[PDB]
Amino acid sequence: SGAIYVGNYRVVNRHLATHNDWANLVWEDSSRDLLVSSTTAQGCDTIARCDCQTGVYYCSSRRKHYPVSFSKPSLIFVEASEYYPARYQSHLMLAVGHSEPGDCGGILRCQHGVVGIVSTGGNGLVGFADVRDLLWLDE
Numbered sequence: 001s002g003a004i005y006v007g008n009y010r011v012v013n014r015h016l017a018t019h020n021d022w023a024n025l026v027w028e029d030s031s032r033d034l035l036v037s038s039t040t041a042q043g044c045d046t047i048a049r050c051d052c053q054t055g056v057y058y059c060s061s062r063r064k065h066y067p068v069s070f071s072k073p074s075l076i077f078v079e080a081s082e083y084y085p086a087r088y089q090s091h092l093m094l095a096v097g098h099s100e101p102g103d104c105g106g107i108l109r110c111q112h113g114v115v116g117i118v119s120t121g122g123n124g125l126v127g128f129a130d131v132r133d134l135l136w137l138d139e
């Protein structure tokens with residue numbers, strides 16, 4: 001679990017969005033596993049606007065942060081789950097690192113700010129949904 005709070009927006013994994021997120025919907029994209037809802041309170045976070053390919057992510061299944069080298073956002077095939085059929089997920093970045101289901105929503109940060117959130121994983125891999133291209137989060 002986890003979210004990004006920036007301005008009057010909450011950014012979550014689309015597959016973990018709540019009834020309240022859907023009732024306050026701003027934008028969602030199944031192909032990216034992202035959903036953004038509106039908030040009444042002003043948010044705690046800064047979004048990176050950069051091309052970093054290194055950063056640090058929070059891994060809830062270890063209660064620890066780990067450094068990572070990650071690929072640029074791309075279209076990656078993701079196996080079927082209870083939430084989606086087998087499909088290509090866009091704007092996804094992969095890295096070598098521990099992840100389990102339950103780790104979705106953990107933040108990836110570089111020195112410039114928040115880069116994205118955990119969205120996929122596998123045997124020693126972790127995948128992050130990029131948010132750096134969503135320029136409107138800042139206004």
Ligand SMILES: NC(=O)[C@H]1CCCN(C(=O)[C@H]2CCc3cccc(Br)c32)C1
Nearest residue numbers: 033078081083099100101119120121122
């Ligand atoms: N973005 C998606 O389609 C997600 C939906 C939930 C499921 N998903 C995953 O990758 C999960 C299932 C297998 C596994 C192993 C280690 C970490 C994670 Br996170 C996962 C894809």
Ligand SMILES: [Zn+2]
Nearest residue numbers: 050052110112
């Ligand atoms: Zn950066």
